């Protein structure tokens, strides 16, 4: 499926199985734009999180309960949802993907 292929290609699962990851089907600049959208609290207590005004096309890749390295197995779910990212730096850009809603 898409998740198994992309998780491997993007170097998430070549050397382990990662429980969850999200891919966003939008331009890089459209996701970078989220760091000047709605400032929200982060779960970690920090306050450098931002939520997109709009929903975006996203695929969630979630490992199955029985999956184990090397043969990682993913459930694929497609949705249109808002994204929440942590931003840092100069330029002030996304550095972590937090949630989708």
């Amino acid at each position: 499926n898409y998740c198994n292929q992309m998780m491997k290609s993007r170097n998430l699962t070549k050397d382990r199985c990662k429980p969850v990851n999200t891919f966003v089907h939008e331009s890089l600049a459209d996701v970078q734009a989220v760091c000047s959208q709605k400032n929200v609290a982060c779960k970690n207590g920090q306050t450098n999180c931002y939520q997109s005004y709009s929903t975006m096309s996203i695929t969630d890749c979630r490992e199955t309960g029985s999956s184990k390295y090397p043969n990682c197995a993913y459930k694929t779910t497609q949705a249109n949802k808002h994204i929440i990212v942590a931003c840092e730096g100069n330029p002030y850009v996304p550095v972590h993907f937090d949630a989708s809603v």
Partner: peptide, 14 residues
Amino acid sequence: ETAAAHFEQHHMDS
């Protein structure tokens, strides 16, 4: 890689 580069590699699929 930078944290920013990692983010784009791990999450973006334009």
